[PDB]
């Protein structure tokens, strides 16, 4: 229900919400969340 309420914010921030998986210090797989910049995303999309 909370996610449904926050749908608009999540949709807005979807292109900038980067997530990766690492083998963390806890000896378990962990998911890391971070911010991707619009300039970086556009540069990555550039064709070269």
């Amino acid at each position: 229900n909370f996610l449904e309420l926050a749908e608009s914010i999540l949709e807005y921030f979807r292109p900038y919400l980067g997530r990766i998986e690492i083998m963390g210090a806890s000896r378990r797989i962990e998911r890391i969340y971070f911010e991707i910049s619009e300039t970086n995303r556009a540069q990555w999309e550039m064709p070269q």
């Binding site: 980067g18 997530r19 990766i20 998986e21 991707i36 990555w44």
Partner: protein, 48 residues
């Protein structure tokens, strides 16, 4: 030989994850599981 190398690259990228090396059969247990894994969970662009 060049054609075979291109085909091998395509087959590998379609069959196993570039990061963890797990086959697509394990991920496809859920609908479009391999696609979601390679787009959101172990995305190369996200690691970069």
């Amino acid at each position: 030989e060049l054609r075979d190398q291109q085909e091998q690259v395509k087959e590998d990228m379609e069959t196993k994850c570039f990061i963890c090396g797990i086959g697509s059969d394990y991920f496809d247990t859920t609908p479009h599981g391999f696609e979601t894994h390679t787009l959101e969970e172990h995305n190369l662009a996200n690691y970069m």
